[PDB]
Subunit: 108 residues, 3 copies
């Protein structure tokens, strides 16, 4: 049942706290900006303003379409305006018809 | 030993429980359909059945080749606990010579 | 904050066995200028080893870098990774924000 896909997108970002991740995920789905969101606890080590830090974060992966992606990304920024958040987008190359159709059905 | 690659695939899906994930991963490797499978605990938020839900799940990532991918997905569908499984496929664009060779040879 | 097309960012994925190993390798890669950020996630990995199915705890690592540093990062992993034959899978994000891409590039 695999089909080629070019219009699905995964938006990856991080936030510091579980509570923020949960709230952002719920509201993005309610807004029709993403169909599904996963939240994974991580540790991140990074260069920021000269120094190296290791902090706990929540990795978020938002499932959306190319049509909703800009709106989603801008909306997420609006939710933590003080942050320069991680923003990486991946394009899946295939999916199932049913999963693709469900995902597209979930967006507004 | 970095090489450009086009024939490797990652198939992403989720299941509800650790037990389900462990069993499905083992069976896929046993069948020669995936070289290796990672399992990561997540929380997932989505609307289903008219209502927004947040539930704990296990993210699975199956490493395979383009040649085995259809067989893996057909198998996974027959064996997956969900009526509508997540199915997303990524293509890595580079690997190491040794890792690519391991993955392909293991199938 | 707007999304822009990106072709020169890379995510290198590998695993190690322990949290300590992952923290040390991540710190060392950032210190050497080979990655801007490294995330670490505990996982289980299932694979066949010596003819038998194994399932082991591991740490999934994701190194955020540029195409220009990718070869040097992989070469450095040849010497520094704890495993003789590490996982090595590289993804290319297709978009990012201007701010994030600029942060990542300026960190290296």
């Amino acid at each position: 049942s695999l089909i080629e896909t070019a219009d699905l997108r995964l938006l990856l970002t991080t936030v510091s706290t579980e509570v923020e991740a949960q709230q952002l995920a719920q509201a993005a789905v309610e807004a029709g900006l993403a169909a599904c969101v996963s939240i994974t606890p991580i540790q991140s080590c990074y260069r920021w303003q000269g120094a190296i830090a290791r902090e706990t974060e929540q990795q978020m992966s938002f499932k959306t379409t190319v049509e909703q992606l800009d709106a989603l990304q801008q909306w997420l920024q609006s939710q933590h305006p003080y942050a320069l958040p991680e923003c990486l987008v991946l394009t899946p190359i295939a999916s199932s018809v049913a999963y693709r159709d469900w995902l597209r059905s979930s967006l507004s």
